[PDB]
Design a protein around this ligand. Structure first.
Ligand SMILES: [Mg+2]
Ligand SMILES: [Mg+2]
Ligand SMILES: [Mg+2]
Ligand SMILES: [Mg+2]
Ligand SMILES: [Mg+2]
Lengths: 207, 170, 201, 103, 125, 40
RNA sequence: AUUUUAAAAUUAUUUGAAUUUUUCUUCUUAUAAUUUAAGUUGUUUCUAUACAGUACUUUCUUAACCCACUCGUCUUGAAAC
RNA sequence: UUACCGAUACCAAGCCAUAAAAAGAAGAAAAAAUUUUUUUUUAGAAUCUUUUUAUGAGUAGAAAAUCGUGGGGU
RNA sequence: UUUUUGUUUGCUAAUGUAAAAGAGAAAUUAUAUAUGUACCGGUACAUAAAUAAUCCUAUCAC
């Protein structure tokens, strides 16, 4: 579904109407009369195999390769763990500076693209969002120090979705790693953290 | 008494009802005393009555002189208010007696609260000038003295953040 | 003005403009060490400048001159005064800014070895036409009873020799580095070398 | 290198101002190597964080931060106006601000 | 400043203090409007005390609502509680300052039965 | 002219290209350091 | 609790024309949905698996930026020497 | 010559009051639970309710609505 | 000087930063010219001339 008004062609995703609002003189009613929200539409830059910096998270400045545009809008990303240390991670387009560089423009790696695409497809949106039960379990540990952390980690590991994600990541690594390693400079780049320095002015940097 | 005490078993009180001494001088004396061991305070008072150590007049210091003794308290001005000291000495003695009556060793007693309030003034007349009567009031004071024997929330996200920070530091 | 401490070589600068430049920086929040303030310049003739300063001197407080306009007449102090003139120095912020400024005559114990910057917006070379009369601040100060001018000059001269010596060594080091680079461009890889060449190094 | 930059360094100057009227809803930020309107415009949407230290701990820490949006450039010389969630205090007026690369 | 909490907009958390109430004890802080030539507050010079005005008023819809979103109703007696059985979400009880401890307890009990909030349950607790 | 063109190149570089240059410099430094050591 | 309808617009169909021959060509015959109509909705975190904590709301207290002259009064005019 | 900064004026939107203007003596809406329960509302006070638009300086002065004190009847 | 843990009766355990995120950068000098180098201020030869539009220094973990 899409609407094409004044030449845009906007694309409509069906949304749910969660919030109830108090009606004027009798009882409650759902706020959103609207049923179909316009889709995010990512910028003409975010591709399927570009390296991108992750600006914001714990993995701050690590350059990771983009994996899947995730329907929801925010996209998946991997620093094929065993290369970089960034796992299969979901991230918004905004907390990424996608570079001009592309993995699938190197002559060696470009031929492994179909498999990568397939792997990406295998990933879903709901496989990231942690279920309530797990969260509850995690919380339950708060009634020593390092022990607690360990327990939390264990709990995280336990989740089936998480396990699946891990497996996927591993598969991706297997697919990708050796070629990347062989292109030594590129591998190094992937490993390294992007930093601003005096001289790197930022507004002039076409990266 | 104006203090907060908790255990009055370790305290020894003492008061003067309406002392016919100047509030200002006696206030100064009290200030000089306060937070002293009782015996030391007593000693000091005795010295001042025999004009050996001054009491430094820091607050009510209009016109008060410029003694050599005031150097001891990092100050220029001081006096040797005798009458005030005597009154104060009496009340210290009373306090000591009270302590004795209790089971408080007077060596370990600190003046925790030396309060001097001004009391209701006695009124007299002085005669001035072109047939004008003026007041010639005393400024008496109440003295209260108290000697006293002397010798969370974690959160999961927050925890995670902390751990991450620690890791980064490492 | 994002550095910790700018040293400003005040030689060849135009007093007022330089001061103005300093003041804004100070306000923003930036320690500034104005160094070599004997050589600041003023845009009038010398005599004119002297006259102005004489007039300034004349304005003391009639009643009791211990208070009232202090006629600080070391060139550094003059500079400082000028700077103050352009700050809201009767506030707290202004005061802080003022404090942040240090001024020196010649160059002493750290500021020999710090880099010395220059404000080209306030350079006499760029700001006065060469047929205009200017005046060295130090000379002016001397004329109005500073005295320690010759001494300062001597000190400067002494320092210059040291600087020259240091510079020779530096030059030698640079040359050595260059040589090493030349040697060790051949020993890297080819592609990397090519890349390096492409971007200047 | 322990810790990575990922922001442009900045100086929180005064508030938006007349000569003698205050307007504390906006602050003015100087961004390090940005000298013109045009260059300032690059940063216009970026998020700005004034992080600062305190003596007492708060959420178990001594550092807190107020966030802002960088609303608009501020006339010719690369200064930008930044609007913060809560107004920044004038205790801040010489201080460093971090202008993040997000968005 | 403006003090949003949710839909409650308060335009002015600061009280309007009487002009010069700060200077003389005899002048209490209770707002009094300065008459008098040359007042400066009356004349509204920059930097002086503000004058309360009808512009400051809260939106007709949220006006007497407390942070609770509930109109306060003061209650002296159980009988009075009854009007708010049919309004237990819109109104919240305050028990009158003069009500005795036993009576207060009783009132609190009644309120609990009604599901109606009591804003001063803790009095004499 | 040379310097201008170098500047232009620097301006127009990709992140990766910058990283490449950095890597190259590092390599050179290593080599350079070794040579210095040898000299000393 | 029927002007958050009607229509406009859009999408996918269906009948008939038009000269701007056009994957946005227009009108109109009918039908469904949609929002560009018909004033912000969603998603995910956090507060938080908390009963008050250092967070949150609030009072006071200090600073800081900017501003601010003693009110009353007679007076053309008062911060008034 | 541009660009900029710059008011309580201007503009857009919100909220208050005033003024005027429209206009007004019957009914299920939703969510959450698991087809039935629970959760809120289910309005109709004419000097009142809903909505609209404009406007808002002010001494002397005028008016209205409010607020409070001592006592009275209810 | 070094290490550890901390600063989450008036007191007797104890905290503050007008500014850390690479806060990097020592010729000198003239401005209708300078600077070196080598000889005797002079001569000859190099060198800079959008000079921080640069150079240095970062990531290669154990
Ligand atoms: Mg007047
Ligand atoms: Mg003023
Ligand atoms: Mg007259
Ligand atoms: Mg007056
Ligand atoms: Mg009016």
């Amino acid at each position: 579904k899409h609407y094409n008004v004044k030449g845009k062609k906007k694309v409509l995703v069906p949304v749910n109407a969660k919030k109830t609002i108090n009606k004027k003189y009798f009882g409650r009613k759902v706020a959103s009369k609207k049923k179909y929200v316009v889709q995010r539409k990512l910028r003409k830059s975010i591709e399927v195999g570009k390296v991108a910096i992750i600006l914001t998270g714990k993995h701050m400045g690590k350059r990771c390769i983009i994996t899947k545009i995730l329907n929801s809008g925010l996209l998946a990303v991997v620093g094929p763990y065993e290369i970089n240390g960034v796992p299969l991670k979901r991230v918004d387009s905004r907390y990424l500076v996608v570079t001009s560089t592309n993995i699938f423009n190197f002559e060696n790696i470009a031929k492994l693209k179909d498999d990568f695409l397939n792997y990406a497809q295998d990933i879903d949106d709901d496989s990231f969002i942690k279920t309530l039960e797990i969260k509850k379990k995690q919380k339950k540990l708060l009634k020593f120090m390092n022990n607690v952390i360990d327990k939390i980690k264990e709990i995280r590991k336990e989740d089936p979705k998480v396990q699946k994600l891990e497996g996927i990541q591993k598969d991706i690594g297997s697919l990708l790693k050796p070629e990347i390693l062989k292109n030594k400079v590129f591998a190094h780049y992937l490993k390294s953290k992007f930093t601003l320095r005096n001289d790197m002015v930022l507004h002039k940097m076409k990266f | 008494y104006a203090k907060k005490i908790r255990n009055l078993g370790k305290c020894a009180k003492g008061a003067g009802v309406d002392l016919r001494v100047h509030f200002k001088n006696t206030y100064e004396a009290a200030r000089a005393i306060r937070r002293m061991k009782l015996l030391e305070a007593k000693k000091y008072l005795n010295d001042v009555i025999e004009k050996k150590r001054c009491v430094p007049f820091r607050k009510y210091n209009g016109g008060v002189g410029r003694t050599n003794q005031a150097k001891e308290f990092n100050h220029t001005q001081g006096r040797w208010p005798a009458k005030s000291c005597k009154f104060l000495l009496n009340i210290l003695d009373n306090v000591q007696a009270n302590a004795e009556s209790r089971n408080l060793d007077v060596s370990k007693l600190r003046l925790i609260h030396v309060m001097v309030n001004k009391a209701r003034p006695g009124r007299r007349r002085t005669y001035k000038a072109h047939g004008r009567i003026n007041p010639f009031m005393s400024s008496p004071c109440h003295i209260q003295i108290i000697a006293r024997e002397i010798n969370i929330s974690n959160q999961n996200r927050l925890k995670n953040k902390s751990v991450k920070k620690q890791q980064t530091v490492q | 003005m994002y550095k910790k401490e700018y040293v400003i070589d005040c030689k060849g600068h135009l007093l007022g403009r330089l001061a103005s430049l300093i003041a804004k920086e100070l306000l923003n929040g930036q320690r500034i060490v104005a160094v070599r303030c004997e050589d600041i310049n003023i845009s009038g003739s010398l005599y004119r400048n002297k006259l102005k300063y004489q007039e300034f001197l004349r304005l003391r407080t009639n009643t009791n001159p211990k208070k009232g306009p202090l006629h600080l007449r070391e060139p550094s102090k003059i500079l400082w005064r000028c700077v103050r003139g352009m700050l809201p120095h009767k506030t707290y912020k202004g005061q802080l800014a003022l404090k942040k400024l240090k001024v020196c005559v010649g160059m002493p114990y750290p500021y020999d070895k710090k880099k010395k910057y220059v404000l080209p917006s306030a350079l006499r070379a760029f700001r006065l036409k060469k047929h205009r009369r200017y005046c060295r601040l130090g000379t002016l100060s001397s004329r109005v009873g500073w005295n320690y001018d010759t001494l300062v000059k001597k000190n400067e001269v002494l320092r210059k020799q040291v600087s020259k010596a240091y510079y020779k060594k530096k030059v030698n080091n640079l040359n050595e580095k260059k040589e090493i680079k030349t040697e060790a461009l051949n020993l890297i890889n080819p592609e990397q070398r090519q890349v390096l060449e492409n971007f200047g190094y | 290198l322990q810790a990575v930059r990922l922001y442009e360094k900045g100086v929180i100057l005064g508030y938006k101002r007349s000569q003698r009227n205050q307007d504390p809803n906006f602050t003015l930020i100087s961004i390090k190597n940005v000298n013109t309107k045009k260059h300032a415009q690059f940063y216009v949407g970026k998020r700005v964080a004034y992080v600062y230290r305190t003596t007492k701990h708060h959420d178990g820490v001594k550092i807190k931060c107020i966030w802002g949006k960088v609303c608009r450039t501020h006339g010719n010389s690369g200064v930008i106006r930044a609007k913060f969630k809560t107004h920044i205090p004038p205790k801040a007026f010489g201080d460093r601000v971090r202008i993040l690369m997000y968005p | 400043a403006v003090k949003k909490v949710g839909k409650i907009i308060k335009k002015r958390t600061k009280k309007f203090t009487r002009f010069q109430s700060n200077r003389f004890m005899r002048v209490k802080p209770a707002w009094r409007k300065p008459r008098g030539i040359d007042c400066r507050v009356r004349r509204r010079y920059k930097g002086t005390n503000l004058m309360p005005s009808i512009g400051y008023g809260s939106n007709k819809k949220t006006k007497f609502l407390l942070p609770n979103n509930k109109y306060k109703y003061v209650v002296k007696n159980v009988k009075e509680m009854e009007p708010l059985i049919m309004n237990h979400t819109k109104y919240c009880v305050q028990i009158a300052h003069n009500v005795s401890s036993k009576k207060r307890k009783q009132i609190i009990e009644r309120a609990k039965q009604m599901n109606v909030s009591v804003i001063n349950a803790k009095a004499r607790l | 002219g040379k310097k201008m063109i170098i500047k232009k190149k620097r301006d127009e570089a990709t992140d990766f290209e910058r990283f490449q240059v950095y890597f190259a410099k590092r390599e050179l430094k290593k080599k350079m350091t070794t040579i210095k050591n040898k000299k000393n």
